[PDB]
């Protein structure tokens, strides 16, 4: 269900082109004639409002925005009951006869597991996890448990529900912790970091994506280079510049990945320009980054403007370490900013204690604040040193 999830994701916010939502809408109507996508489109209008929420024919009666092409016509309306008879009335009667004839054990479990995948395309989630629970008691080895954790993971992928799905994803590994091969051991930890990207835990969850996407891909939902853009942007985002030379710019998979398609423009254009300390050509590569990468990708657009605040402070911080004092004519008259427009970027970063820099408003001499031998031994020691008696007397003064 990645095709309808990735392409129709442009229905959230697209400020670039109008045909982006139109071209992606063709894949929605093409894939829905085979398998039922109806519960996916119903949630699109129930998530974001006053943008695309008025395009549904029957939810409430509304017409708005630019898109008349996403809807259920009189054909799919009559096909709504046709798919329900095949996915419920037809399948449940065949499995019910298996319990009466008592044929096999794991074969009956795989029947409920395969049937449980149809409930994801139905839109009733109470019977989705119920059928998986019936096959849970019939599951013996780890072969039948592979598709169980995949169907449960689709509940948060297909319905975009990060609340009730993460409880079931953790319940499988917590009740019985085995993992089998290290391939699945990374799968239980991958789904853990997916729901943490919705709450935006930053480098905690995002550090596992660059490791998993550079080794193995499920290959069933998508391809290797389609979701590779998630690890390309978060690669330089989470990892410091010191380790970018031994990891990102030199990699067996990444250097062969840029030759597959030009839609990345991260591990190549942004990495080489950042390692060369040249910000003249580095910034125009960011112009095609957010547009052609962050917006179309799902988990990347969940952040969007959350990337730059961490990245914009870091790109200048690395330049301040290479010189004691810089010049305003280098920043204002050359690369990324003008004179007056510089106050908007570094103006809000310093009061947040993100970086320490000094700009001269007369002679135009940029000055860098260097802690020298102070560092965390003196100043930062006082800050985090007060937490010793703060956390001790918090619950300690009340005894029991």
């Amino acid at each position: 269900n990645y095709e309808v999830s990735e392409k129709a994701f442009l229905l959230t916010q697209s400020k670039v082109s109008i045909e982006q939502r139109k071209e992606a809408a063709e894949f929605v109507l093409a894939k829905i004639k085979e398998e039922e996508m109806a519960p996916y489109y119903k949630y699109l209008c129930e998530e974001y409002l006053v943008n695309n929420g008025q395009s549904d024919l029957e939810h409430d009666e509304k017409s708005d925005s630019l898109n008349e092409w996403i809807k259920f016509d009189q054909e799919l309306y009559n096909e709504l009951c046709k798919k329900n008879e095949s996915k419920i009335k037809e399948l449940n009667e065949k499995i019910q006869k298996l319990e009466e004839d008592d044929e096999g054990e794991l074969e009956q479990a795989q029947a409920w597991i395969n049937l449980g995948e149809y409930y994801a395309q139905i839109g009733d989630k109470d019977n989705a996890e119920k059928t998986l629970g019936k096959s849970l008691s019939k599951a013996i080895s780890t072969g039948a448990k592979i598709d169980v954790m995949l169907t449960i993971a689709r509940l948060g992928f297909f319905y975009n529900d990060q609340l009730y799905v993460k409880e079931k994803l953790e319940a499988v590994n917590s009740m019985i912790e085995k993992g089998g091969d290290w391939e699945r051991r990374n799968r239980y930890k991958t789904y853990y970091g997916i729901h943490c990207l919705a709450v935006r835990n930053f480098k905690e969850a995002a550090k596992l994506l660059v490791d998993s996407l550079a080794t193995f891909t499920s290959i069933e939902l998508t391809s290797y280079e389609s979701i590779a853009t998630y690890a390309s942007v978060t690669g330089l985002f989470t990892l410091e510049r010191t380790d970018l030379k031994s990891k990102v710019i030199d990699s067996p998979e990444l250097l062969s990945l840029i030759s597959t398609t030009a839609a990345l423009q991260s591990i190549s254009s942004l990495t080489i320009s950042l390692y060369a300390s040249d910000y003249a050509s580095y910034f125009p590569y960011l112009l095609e980054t957010y547009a052609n990468v962050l917006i179309p990708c799902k988990y990347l657009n969940r952040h969007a403007d959350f990337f730059v605040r961490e990245m914009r402070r870091k790109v200048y911080a690395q330049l301040l370490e290479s010189y004691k004092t810089l010049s305003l004519k280098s920043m204002a008259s050359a690369f990324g900013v003008s004179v007056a427009f510089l106050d908007n970027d570094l103006g809000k970063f310093i009061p947040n204690k993100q970086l320490n820099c000094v700009i001269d408003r007369v002679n135009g001499i940029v000055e860098t604040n260097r802690p020298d031998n102070k560092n965390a031994q003196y100043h930062l020691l006082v800050k985090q040193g007060d937490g010793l008696l703060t956390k001790l007397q918090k619950y300690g003064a009340a005894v029991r």
Binding site: Q377, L381, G385, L388, L389, L392, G396, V399, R400
Partner: protein, 105 residues
């Protein structure tokens, strides 16, 4: 052998003051004898006496540099602040003992 027949930080500092008065009482009594009444034949010993005073008996020229030498003393208080907090580690663990006594009681 003599220890068996005969048988901390504040006591060690007590001997320091006794050595401070030794510097005071030895110089004042000796120097006052050479000067004023009854000058003995001297200036042979005086060269050795003033050899101590050149190097608040020592040097005020390092007062600016002394603050850099005092830094090690300030560093000793950096860890000691946690060492004083390290006593609260056992102090918090010992809280479980009495709390356990109330459960058994």
């Amino acid at each position: 052998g003599v220890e068996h027949l005969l048988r901390i930080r504040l006591t060690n500092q007590l001997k320091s003051l006794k050595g401070l008065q030794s510097k005071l009482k030895d110089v004042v009594e000796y120097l006052d004898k050479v000067i004023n009444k009854e000058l003995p034949i001297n200036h042979t010993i005086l060269g050795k006496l003033q050899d101590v005073f050149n190097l608040n008996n020592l040097q005020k020229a390092l007062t600016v540099k002394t603050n850099d030498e005092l830094m090690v003393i300030y560093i000793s208080n950096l860890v000691r602040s946690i060492i004083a907090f390290d006593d609260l580690i056992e102090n918090k663990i010992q809280n479980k003992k009495i709390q356990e006594q109330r459960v058994k009681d």
